[PDB]
Write an enzyme that holds these catalytic residues in place. Sequence first.
Site, PDB file in Angstrom:
ATOM      1  N   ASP A   1      26.479  40.445  26.839  1.00 16.70           N
ATOM      2  CA  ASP A   1      26.551  41.764  27.452  1.00 16.70           C
ATOM      3  C   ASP A   1      25.221  42.494  27.320  1.00 16.70           C
ATOM      4  O   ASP A   1      24.846  43.274  28.201  1.00 16.70           O
ATOM      5  CB  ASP A   1      27.679  42.571  26.816  1.00 16.70           C
ATOM      6  CG  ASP A   1      29.034  41.926  27.012  1.00 16.70           C
ATOM      7  OD1 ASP A   1      29.124  40.954  27.788  1.00 16.70           O
ATOM      8  OD2 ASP A   1      30.007  42.385  26.380  1.00 16.70           O
TER       9      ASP A   1
ATOM     10  N   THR B   1      34.731  41.671  28.068  1.00 17.84           N
ATOM     11  CA  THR B   1      34.660  41.158  26.670  1.00 17.84           C
ATOM     12  C   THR B   1      35.856  41.625  25.852  1.00 17.84           C
ATOM     13  O   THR B   1      35.922  42.783  25.440  1.00 17.84           O
ATOM     14  CB  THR B   1      33.370  41.616  25.965  1.00 17.84           C
ATOM     15  OG1 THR B   1      32.246  41.399  26.825  1.00 17.84           O
ATOM     16  CG2 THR B   1      33.167  40.850  24.664  1.00 17.84           C
ATOM     17  N   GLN B   2      36.810  40.721  25.626  1.00 20.60           N
ATOM     18  CA  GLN B   2      37.923  41.035  24.738  1.00 20.60           C
ATOM     19  C   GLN B   2      37.502  40.952  23.277  1.00 20.60           C
ATOM     20  O   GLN B   2      37.976  41.735  22.446  1.00 20.60           O
ATOM     21  CB  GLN B   2      39.096  40.093  25.011  1.00 20.60           C
ATOM     22  CG  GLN B   2      39.709  40.255  26.394  1.00 20.60           C
ATOM     23  CD  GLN B   2      40.223  41.660  26.643  1.00 20.60           C
ATOM     24  OE1 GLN B   2      40.810  42.283  25.761  1.00 20.60           O
ATOM     25  NE2 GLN B   2      40.001  42.164  27.852  1.00 20.60           N
ATOM     26  N   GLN B   3      36.621  40.013  22.945  1.00 21.35           N
ATOM     27  CA  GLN B   3      36.063  39.898  21.610  1.00 21.35           C
ATOM     28  C   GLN B   3      34.589  39.540  21.717  1.00 21.35           C
ATOM     29  O   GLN B   3      34.185  38.849  22.659  1.00 21.35           O
ATOM     30  CB  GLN B   3      36.790  38.828  20.779  1.00 21.35           C
ATOM     31  CG  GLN B   3      36.630  37.410  21.311  1.00 21.35           C
ATOM     32  CD  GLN B   3      37.408  36.393  20.502  1.00 21.35           C
ATOM     33  OE1 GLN B   3      38.039  36.731  19.500  1.00 21.35           O
ATOM     34  NE2 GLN B   3      37.364  35.136  20.930  1.00 21.35           N
TER      35      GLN B   3
ATOM     36  N   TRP C   1      30.847  45.028  25.310  1.00 20.63           N
ATOM     37  CA  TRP C   1      31.000  45.164  23.864  1.00 20.63           C
ATOM     38  C   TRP C   1      29.642  45.398  23.199  1.00 20.63           C
ATOM     39  O   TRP C   1      29.142  44.590  22.419  1.00 20.63           O
ATOM     40  CB  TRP C   1      31.691  43.931  23.303  1.00 20.63           C
ATOM     41  CG  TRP C   1      32.529  44.226  22.116  1.00 20.63           C
ATOM     42  CD1 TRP C   1      32.100  44.460  20.844  1.00 20.63           C
ATOM     43  CD2 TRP C   1      33.953  44.334  22.088  1.00 20.63           C
ATOM     44  NE1 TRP C   1      33.173  44.704  20.022  1.00 20.63           N
ATOM     45  CE2 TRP C   1      34.323  44.632  20.763  1.00 20.63           C
ATOM     46  CE3 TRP C   1      34.953  44.205  23.055  1.00 20.63           C
ATOM     47  CZ2 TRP C   1      35.651  44.802  20.382  1.00 20.63           C
ATOM     48  CZ3 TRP C   1      36.267  44.375  22.676  1.00 20.63           C
ATOM     49  CH2 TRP C   1      36.606  44.669  21.351  1.00 20.63           C
TER      50      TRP C   1
END
Lengths: 230, 230, 203, 196, 196, 220, 81, 81, 212, 221
Positions: A59, A1-3, A111
């Site tokens: 997530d 998860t980048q964002q 995240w």
Amino acid sequence: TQQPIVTGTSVISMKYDNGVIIAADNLGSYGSLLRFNGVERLIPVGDNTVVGISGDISDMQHIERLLKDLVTENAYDNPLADAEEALEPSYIFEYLATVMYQRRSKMNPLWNAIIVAGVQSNGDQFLRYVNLLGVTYSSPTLATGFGAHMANPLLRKVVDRESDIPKTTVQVAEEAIVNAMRVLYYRDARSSRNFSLAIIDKNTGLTFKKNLQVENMKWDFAKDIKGYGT
Amino acid sequence: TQQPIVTGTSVISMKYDNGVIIAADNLGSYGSLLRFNGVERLIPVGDNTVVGISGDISDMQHIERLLKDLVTENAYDNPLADAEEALEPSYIFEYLATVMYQRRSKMNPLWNAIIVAGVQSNGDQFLRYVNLLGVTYSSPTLATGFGAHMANPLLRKVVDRESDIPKTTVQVAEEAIVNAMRVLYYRDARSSRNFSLAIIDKNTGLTFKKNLQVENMKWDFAKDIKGYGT
Amino acid sequence: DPSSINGGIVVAMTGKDCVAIACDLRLGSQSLGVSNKFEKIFHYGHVFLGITGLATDVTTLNEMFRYKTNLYKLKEERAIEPETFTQLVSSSLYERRFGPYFVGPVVAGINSKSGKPFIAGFDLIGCIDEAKDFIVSGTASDQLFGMCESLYEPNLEPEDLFETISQALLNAADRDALSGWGAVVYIIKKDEVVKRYLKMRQD
Amino acid sequence: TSIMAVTFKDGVILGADSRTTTGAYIANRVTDKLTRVHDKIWCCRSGSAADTQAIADIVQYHLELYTSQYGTPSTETAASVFKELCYENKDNLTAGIIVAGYDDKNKGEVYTIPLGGSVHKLPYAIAGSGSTFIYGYCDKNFRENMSKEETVDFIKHSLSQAIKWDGSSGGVIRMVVLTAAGVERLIFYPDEYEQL
Amino acid sequence: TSIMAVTFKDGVILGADSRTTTGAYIANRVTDKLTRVHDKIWCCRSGSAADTQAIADIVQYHLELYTSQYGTPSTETAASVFKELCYENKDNLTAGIIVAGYDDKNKGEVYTIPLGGSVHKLPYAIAGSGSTFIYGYCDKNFRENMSKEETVDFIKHSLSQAIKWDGSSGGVIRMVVLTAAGVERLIFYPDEYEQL
Amino acid sequence: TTIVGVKFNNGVVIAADTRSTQGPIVADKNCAKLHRISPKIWCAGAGTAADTEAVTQLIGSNIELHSLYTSREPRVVSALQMLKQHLFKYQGHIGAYLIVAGVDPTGSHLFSIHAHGSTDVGYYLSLGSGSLAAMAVLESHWKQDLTKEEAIKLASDAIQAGIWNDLGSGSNVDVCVMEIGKDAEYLRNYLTPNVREEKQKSYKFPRGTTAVLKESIVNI
Amino acid sequence: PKFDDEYQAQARQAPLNPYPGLTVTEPSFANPAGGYADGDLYPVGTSHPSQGGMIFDPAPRREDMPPGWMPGSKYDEPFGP
Amino acid sequence: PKFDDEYQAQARQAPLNPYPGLTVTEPSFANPAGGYADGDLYPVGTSHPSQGGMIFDPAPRREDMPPGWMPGSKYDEPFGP
Amino acid sequence: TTTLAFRFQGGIIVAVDSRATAGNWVASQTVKKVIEINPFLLGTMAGGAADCQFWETWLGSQCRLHELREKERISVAAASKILSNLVYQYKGAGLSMGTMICGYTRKEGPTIYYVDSDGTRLKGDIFCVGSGQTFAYGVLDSNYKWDLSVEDALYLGKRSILAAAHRDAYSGGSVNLYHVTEDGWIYHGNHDVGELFWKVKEEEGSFNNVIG
Amino acid sequence: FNPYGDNGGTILGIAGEDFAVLAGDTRNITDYSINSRYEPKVFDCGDNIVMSANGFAADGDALVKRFKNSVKWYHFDHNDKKLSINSAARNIQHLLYGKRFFPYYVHTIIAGLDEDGKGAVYSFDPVGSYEREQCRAGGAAASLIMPFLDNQVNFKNQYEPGTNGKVKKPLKYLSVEEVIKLVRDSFTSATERHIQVGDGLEILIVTKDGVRKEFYELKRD
């Protein structure tokens, strides 16, 4: 998860004389769009453990699957699994923290901010926090997101130090949690009126009050405002 | 203005044996949101001139106010202003082009593309294009936005060169314009079903057919398409 | 810019039954001209390959095509034809699609069976550009295009073909800063090849 | 934000939500977004709060001076002043505004001035980040010449949905009813419009 | 895009618009966005066309193998496969998908997988850039256990407004009616659904 | 580039112009843009020209291998599947945009493929810098169940519109007609409207005009 | 509100190497940015203390071009405008 | 979908001068643009040809701090996190 | 561009090429790179053609005002100072200039002032300017003498420009020569490099690496 | 906001004894779209001078209007006297350099007969910098057009046969008709190989008898 994309705002919890209380709203927000309202972010993992999760909802579901698999694998070749050598809150939290740190080190974080609350089989309350960076800590009261600022002071007013835990009863802690959730609804734009609350007690086990309502809202003073300045 | 916020998509026009025909849809779009459907983008400035405008709608209204002020100030101390020494299409276009180029030079451009269509007192058709950069040109057919690509070939198939203008009657040009509107409605995402059409004729003056509908749409072949690939 | 750092020119034309390929001899690094004898025309049997672009890639592809064409000659017992060589060059250039050589190659020759003149050009990554009249590449590509378009006409004899191609190259190079220092023109026939060095401006 | 104005048989009803946010934090949950620029002319602020308040004060100054020099302005005069101020400073300004008012010759009128600074009369107008979620509802439910109660219920339902779906909209739904009888403040609390 | 699945008394009706834009240009105005991933399971595609089509082909492969090895899958199995593919490649992928299907035990089911890659069962789901304009309408007009004709009219009105307001949505409204009787393709042309 | 495909009552016709441009310079005046994937599957591409050539060559080789393997005539959908999977694998870095049209035992097919691997069914399609000009004509004049003659005329005229109204499109019109019952008809330079203006003078130089320093004979 | 490009045909691409393949022009190699204690090694703190001609006249950057584009390759816009 | 910031409280401020007022650090003065014909004026076209010691310790950027922030001035966050 | 000017017993020799370029495209090969301020003052433009041409034409008008007011010619130092101040006041505005102000005055003798975009002003005996300045220096510094004869000085300037034209891509065209004498400046004509090169190779025998 | 564009036009000035020729295509462009087939960009300027401001169309129009104003004011002041080609060149130089730091992105050419009656062509860069030339192409297809004109009009790289490269071909005058033929062929080549040229060729001839306009068709594809 980048964002993160779809997120659950906050989780608040505290420990009282005989257990721990944890609560979280049922709203998953897609940006500023209050898209999904039926999300459950309190994940029981036994009669002695509840895992509250914030951040990305996908997530969160992955972590929930991880916890289900933890329980399933614990049950293997473990004839005592139902009474002793069952999964303590500490084992769940350590596994989750290890996974979170490994993900962070691999530059592919989960995240989420996770509060694992429960009672050890010896009766000692367990309450710990872990976030996407792998940072972990324990406190008589824990909160995530806006709870760490809005709610956590209110909970700390009730139990400001370890010495106050035995002085705190079920009713006091639950009223503090409900008042903090009401305040979060007032001031948190990502929050919702509906919230779930779980109580883990060393004597009476896990109680899981789902879809509660924020009540006793104070709005009647709004009629006396007529604009900015004049 | 540095960026267009609310915009009108396209205007097309062509000159026929006795005058000029020009049309434009009535939709002003706020990004991809088809917000305002009642906008009028054909601006009559006399019995011999109509101005079609594209781009920012606020700048379009500013330009319309400028044209109204031109008409008002032309009549001052001008006893002949209603029959000769009236505002020709050439004067309107030249004033607009000067204003547009000056705004460009001051780095404060009007984000519009303007087609000034009409007939001079000597009967010669006037049809010229000017955009925000001050670029001007004339042609038997003019279009703005997606019209320059979609519609303009269709109009050029009718009048490909100056020699074809006397061969083109009112009905042929109007059919071409309506077909161009139908095609642009098909393929331009910013376009609308409703459009206005103005005809300036050296003999019969300005005719202004407002709120026309796109008709004879072809959709019945869509029932046979079964998605991507299989 | 790798394709413009060294400069250089290549032009190919087809006569009635002959081809001519010519190139400038300058080798440099932007402003400074380094060598006046960097010949960009290479031949592998009866097929001629001119390569413009980054000089390191010119040498590398010269070596690579020497290797591949020698193996072709040995295991086929026959020289590679201009069409087959064009396909080989295109396939070799595309193999480096994401790491490509910065070269514009130009193939010219005569097919040994049909006796038909053949020329072809390429881009950095092997897009075959076959033409029946003339091919152009290098820093002066546009000047050469205009000059050849103005001068070329079909079915030139070898002598008139030489004059046309030499004049096109000379006048194109005289208007390109990074090209010049002499040129070499090959007049290729079914039985012989004539190499000639042109006198031109040395600036 | 969820602004809304709806003309009806006896006038125009102007409505808005009370939540103001700075990011995810609700910096003010009972703010009043309806402003009285003139006796029977009310504007609603959307976009930058500073720009909207500056524009509102400048327009109040200009319309007070207009009233003193030339007699009572119309809704159109007010919205024209809004338009000129917003357009001549459109690069600096970031304000979208709805102007609603009642004048006897025209009855209720509504003009909307989107972020670009253009002027549009509409039977009804919706603005703010929460309007995007109620375009379809308002389009399919609006009717000409509604009664006062019908208009109040329509605005209540529309802003209820906008508040439901937009995190930046919430709090009490306030409305101002402009009619020949006068101006009426109306306030509806969450337990009232959320149980619809 | 404006896609919409609605469970009802006899099953689920899946519908979508037929316009595909590339910028302001309409590169395809009669595209069919409903995809049959299994006999009674129809996914619908939003987001990147390449990503959605690749995911659809992979899911078709996986579900065909599942049908051949373990018996017929349910809607939940299909959406779970969509979940694993979308999540384990969420950085590369940008696909938001609705999965609707009919199972004899469960009757009609609808799962929505937003861009983030989560799973949600809903009585009805709306997706695509054009759905934002009908969140209020669908919320205020949806009902449990609608009849077939009521559900068809509901989807028709909802997608009509979505097409009205979204520039990137338009064309014919296609629907697939999943029920015990079978699967029925429906198509409604602009002159039909725009005059509602 | 101006490419169009047009399905008609008994097949599909794909047409393209022939001008090839590098930058603003016309590198080739008569570039053949229609490529065989099979005897009755034809394609024409836009975007990075080299990538289109490489991918069509690869897919044609693989499809002929598979046709020999299965002893069956290739399906157009087989080419579509293989091509779009290959395009997807590279996540659009091969930059090939194609219109693939063909005939197979299942009927006449017309598809488009984009660099990222997305594909579309269509009755008429356009591609390249002249896509909008050609699509205008296709919208204006396409109808259900065109005859072969009407289909050829319509596709040719759409390509002509692209030729006349687009800079990156010109010269001649190539047409290929695939019909259900019989072989494909490739019409090289079907229309040749852009004939060459004659020279005002022949600029041949007298022999000896050029100055030569050295002459030599080369042992090839 | 953006216009929902489904095919990614309008999709456009550390800063990109203007000339892919050549590592001599890679930003990370042309500007390695030294090391954490370079200030202690070198007294200054640093180890290392146009084409326009005489006549003024009016290539693209990869970051502003589609990923399939190769600088200097023959490219045809799939749709153009 | 972004959240509303009506007060512009989270609103953040050519590249910015790291230290306002000092022209010696102005980007247009620290790195001036070359002349249009500098290539013809100088042969190679160019008119011209750290902190932290041995110990690895682990300022704000004016381009992401609010407009009212002055580098090095006392500033209290108005709204908190 | 290549321009050079060197003082010697007989005055000053000013030599310049003719090529002007815009990228790879050679715009023209006959650019006059000497601006003739007055019968005793000579500007040598390099870098940006527009800036040099315009501002030295303006310097001519300033010079004219000077004679009209003060009845005596502007000194080389004064003209170079005016140009230096002007170019300095536009520093950072984008001026592209390299200028040698060559002149002769009774109270100064032969004098050369180098002026450029960055505001510098240098009095000196030898200067080379432009992209090819280094190649011209390589010849001048190896062959220059104060007591060169007029013919030898002219040939030295011609050869020095020829070397830079050969080795520099942006310095071809033709060589224009000026001789600033005690009584004025003498324009010794234009020499095309395409012929001067071969003449010099034959007569000197140099450029032995060049085929021919 | 980018305030500049490129409308893709080409102009060509050629001078010789007895005449001066200024030719330019009528095609007008924006990106890959044809704006108009016939937009003249070579203008009869009166006073036996012809002007063109090819390049960015808006700046061309602005500069042409400014020059018209300046020449008319020159007529107002200097008793309606004929303006010379060198005076016009200096006027245009001052117009162009008046906007040094925001230039007119147009490559201007003025052609005419000088005070001695000999043909003259002046060419400008966007900043100024006018050079009198015997011939000078400009615009998009300048690089295509110009080398061929060098070869034909000036016989560069051409030597008398039999002299083995020692004797150049002498530069005999081209007559006006021969210059028209060269211009037509050069523009035909530029049309054929450049996408921005091929709609129509307009030629203005300047001679003591006055300005004379001729128009020729191009491919227009």
